[PDB]
């Protein structure tokens, strides 16, 4: 046509839930039957700004039974907007944690440095199977306060699960709240109007380097 871009593909819809669980988010049971997903399995929900999220998707009807909705903390973790899109891929990420990885952020915490012996490490993170991810600024329970901790990376295949018996090892460094919404110039097509025709023209100019090197025939 005149401008055959800015098209949403057969992609799954993002909204906001009210669930208590952080690493467990709620996905639609008819969409669970459509995408052949399991009740307890964890997947990757592909948001924009080169950011994906690893969470266990249940069969909960607490969120929408048409739209896949998640937590407010995961919304800040995925750095997306309401009404965005996610791709579904069932590739597992079950590798256990290895070594010291976290960074203490001292807003509401118990045991400011912590360092591998904590109420939110040994009782809470164990027997949880949470997928700990690179850049996981989580707001979880444990240690009597709504703790907030950043993790730099995890070692094996950076999105990977925790162990129910091995305690996650901890770095010690007093850091503070970051500015992730505007730090790395994360804004994309959402925060630039400009000329959307010319934005589409730039996108058309960069189609062939983007995931299609063999589309030169």
């Amino acid at each position: 046509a005149i401008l055959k871009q800015k098209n949403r593909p057969n992609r799954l819809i993002v909204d906001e839930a009210i669930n208590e669980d952080n690493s467990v988010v709620s996905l639609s049971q008819p969409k669970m039957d459509e995408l052949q997903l399991f009740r307890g399995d964890t997947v990757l929900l592909k948001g924009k700004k080169r950011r994906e999220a690893v969470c266990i998707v249940l069969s909960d009807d607490t969120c929408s039974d048409e739209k896949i909705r998640m937590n407010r903390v995961v919304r800040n973790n995925l750095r997306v907007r309401l009404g965005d899109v996610i791709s579904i891929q069932p590739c597992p990420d079950v590798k256990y944690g290895k070594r010291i990885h976290v960074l203490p952020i001292d807003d509401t915490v118990e045991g400011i440095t912590g360092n591998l012996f904590e109420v939110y490490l040994k009782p809470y993170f164990l027997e949880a199977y949470r997928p700990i991810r690179k850049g996981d600024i989580f707001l979880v329970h444990g240690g009597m306060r709504a703790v907030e901790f950043k993790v730099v990376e995890t070692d094996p295949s950076p999105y990977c699960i925790v162990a129910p018996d091995t305690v996650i090892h901890c770095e010690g460094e007093p850091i503070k709240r970051e500015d992730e919404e505007e730090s790395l110039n994360e804004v994309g097509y959402d925060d630039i109007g400009g000329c959307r025709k010319q934005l589409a023209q730039i996108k058309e100019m960069v189609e062939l380097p983007l995931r299609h090197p063999a589309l030169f025939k």
Binding site: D21, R39, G40, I56, V94, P164, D165
Partner: protein, 113 residues
């Protein structure tokens, strides 16, 4: 190796050529019924990230243990308590089936004692 209180894990004692043969034998020893709605149950093994999907509509948890024994011969002696993904419950009562225990397409997380 630090002297922790965690359980000592068991490595893959079966051969890589015997893994496919054991999986084929485990799929052969379990009947498939076409007159009932079949379900697939994922077992989160702790020996490297192995999960298998071959099940019928109704099976006991002891039948899942039979599927585990036919899947790996070295895991027949290890005692394990099966877990789920945050109802925070332990899957005891091996005589119970999947329909009574709400294990319909539900990932069972295997944790060795």
């Amino acid at each position: 190796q630090k002297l922790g209180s965690t359980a000592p894990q068991v490595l893959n004692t079966s051969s890589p050529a015997q893994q496919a043969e054991n999986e084929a034998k485990a799929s052969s020893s379990i009947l498939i019924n076409e007159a009932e709605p079949t379900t697939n149950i994922q077992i989160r093994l702790a020996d490297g990230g192995r999960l298998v999907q071959k099940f019928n509509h109704s099976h006991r948890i002891s039948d899942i243990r039979l599927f585990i024994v036919d899947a790996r011969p070295a895991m027949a002696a290890t005692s394990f308590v099966l877990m789920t993904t945050f109802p925070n419950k332990e899957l005891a009562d091996e005589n119970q089936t999947l329909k009574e225990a709400n294990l319909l397409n539900a990932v069972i997380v295997q944790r060795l004692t």
